[PDB]
Design a protein around this ligand. Structure first.
Ligand SMILES: [Ca+2]
Ligand SMILES: [Ca+2]
Length: 181
């Protein structure tokens, strides 16, 4: 299904082969489980514990929710993360934070993800994420993004906030980018 795969992503046929080669190179069995994913991701952050964030990142890749990320799942997410539009990329990130796939983000979900990011960055969570604690960042995040103040952040509130603030966007995307470097 390389032809079906090429039609659905931003990659050519020969780029897909270069991607497959690298995929098997790192995943001999042809599929990636959580641990393998956590191992690979861990390296992007040696000064912290990125396993919990890598956990959320894994599920977002595992769209079929099979606990096993196939090559197409991998390319499908890369197609977006690597060469998707800001709109497409932000939607991917919103979906990552929307853990229960409510269609919305609550403070509890925000906390989980953000607590994962702080642990990942360790004590070197530079201005990327100011504020001493995750709880303090989450409250400042929601205040700015939850425009109608109903304690919920919808996709639209999320996009508008990001569109009107280069800072909010980075604190969200930064971690998705490290992978498409
Ligand atoms: Ca939700
Ligand atoms: Ca709201």
């Amino acid at each position: 299904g390389l032809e079906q795969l090429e039609a659905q992503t931003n990659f050519t046929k020969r780029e897909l082969q270069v991607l497959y080669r690298g995929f098997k190179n790192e995943c001999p069995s042809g599929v990636v489980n959580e641990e393998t994913f956590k191992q690979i991701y861990a390296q992007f952050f040696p000064h912290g514990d990125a396993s919990t964030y890598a956990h959320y990142l894994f599920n977002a890749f595992d769209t079929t929710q099979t606990g096993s990320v196939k090559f197409e799942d991998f390319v499908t997410a890369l197609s977006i993360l690597l060469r998707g539009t800001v709109h497409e990329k932000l939607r991917w990130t919103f979906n990552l934070y929307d853990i229960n796939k409510d269609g919305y983000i609550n403070k509890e979900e925000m906390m989980d993800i953000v607590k994962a990011i702080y642990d990942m960055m360790g004590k070197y969570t530079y201005p990327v994420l100011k504020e001493d604690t995750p709880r303090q960042h989450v409250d400042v995040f929601f205040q700015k993004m939850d425009k109608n103040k109903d304690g919920i952040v919808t996709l639209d509130e999320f996009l508008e906030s990001c569109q009107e603030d280069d800072n909010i966007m980075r604190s969200l995307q930064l971690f998705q980018n490290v992978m498409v470097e």
